[PDB]
């Protein structure tokens, strides 16, 4: 039994941008089955997660359909998931052949290569397909860990 009341009262949301329908119709219309997501973006990646926006995260990491119906919930975590010595605990893929599909999972650690012939991680033209974010606490408002 949903309530939709703990999201409108508080104002600690970074970007409360709904898509598909309005926020007022979410309390009256029934829903058959809801699906939630959980991921941490590198601050300036919230604008890329939109039905029509592109970049480096909404192409082969988390694809959003153009006819999506929901709401974006983002909030800062500069004190909950931040470390002054280093937060090397989150990575992201930046090398993959072709874009992904909406709501896909690509959990893998195989090396990246343009053609076939799977190479080894130690090579000259083959590198790791993932890279750590590197969240800090003494940076600007752009490089901050936001949970969307």
């Amino acid at each position: 039994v949903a309530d939709y009341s703990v999201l409108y009262n508080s104002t600690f949301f970074s970007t409360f941008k709904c898509y598909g329908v309005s926020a007022t119709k979410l309390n009256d219309l029934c829903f058959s089955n809801v699906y939630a997501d959980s991921f941490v973006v590198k601050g300036d990646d919230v604008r890329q997660i939109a039905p029509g926006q592109t970049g480096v995260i909404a192409d082969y990491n988390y694809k959003l359909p153009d006819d999506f119906m929901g709401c974006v919930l983002a909030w800062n975590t500069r004190n909950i998931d931040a470390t002054s010595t280093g937060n090397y605990n989150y990575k992201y893929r930046y090398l993959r052949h072709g874009k992904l599909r909406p709501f896909e999972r690509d959990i893998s650690n195989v090396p990246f290569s343009p053609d076939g012939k799977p190479c080894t991680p130690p090579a000259l033209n083959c590198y790791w397909p993932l890279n750590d974010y590197g969240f800090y606490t003494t940076t600007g408002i752009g490089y901050q860990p936001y949970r969307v």
Partner: antibody
Amino acid sequence: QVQLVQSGAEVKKPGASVKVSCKTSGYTFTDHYMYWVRQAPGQGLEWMGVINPDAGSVTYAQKFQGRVTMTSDTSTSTVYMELSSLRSEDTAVYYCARDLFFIPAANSFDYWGQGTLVTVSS
Amino acid sequence: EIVLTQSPATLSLSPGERATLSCRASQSVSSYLAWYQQKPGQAPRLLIYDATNRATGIPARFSGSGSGTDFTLTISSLEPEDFAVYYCQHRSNWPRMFTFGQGTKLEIKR
């Protein structure tokens, strides 16, 4: 490779119920929209027939609302269609196709089955 | 529901030319159109989804277009194994609806 194997032919009396299955294999059958179509001889197919395998949500068309009832099985990974009140204009080949997107999204058909010839006569 | 109307409904051309398949809707719908390719006797096959992206396994000779209410399918080079009936599917947004057209036969000109 993704492939959908169906049953063979099945003749049914004009007024009984038909039970046609759609076996899927080759992929993780947990988050994928399943559809159903049937091309009539000379005419075409126009209805959604989308059923959620994971959840228990079903969707039917306007002309076929209380005549068709579908169900899914997360254990055997095979959906079942139950169309009651068989008419003389529904005797055609029934197909079941998957979706290109996942459950939250929706797209066109990408993987088709093989066909199930259903006939309603003597 | 949005109905699909096909005025030509037929296209008799020779292998090597370009196709002029059309798919027009009733109202001013979005670009959520997807064509198909169903060989007579075999199972249907997806050709172009969302009217702006190429499907998997489809060669480079197939390239669709269209925006809003003027959609068309232009084939680069016709192949003898590509002569079949093509259906376009239109999808709605809110009530998870999907509508199909009528189909256009493509017979080899002789």
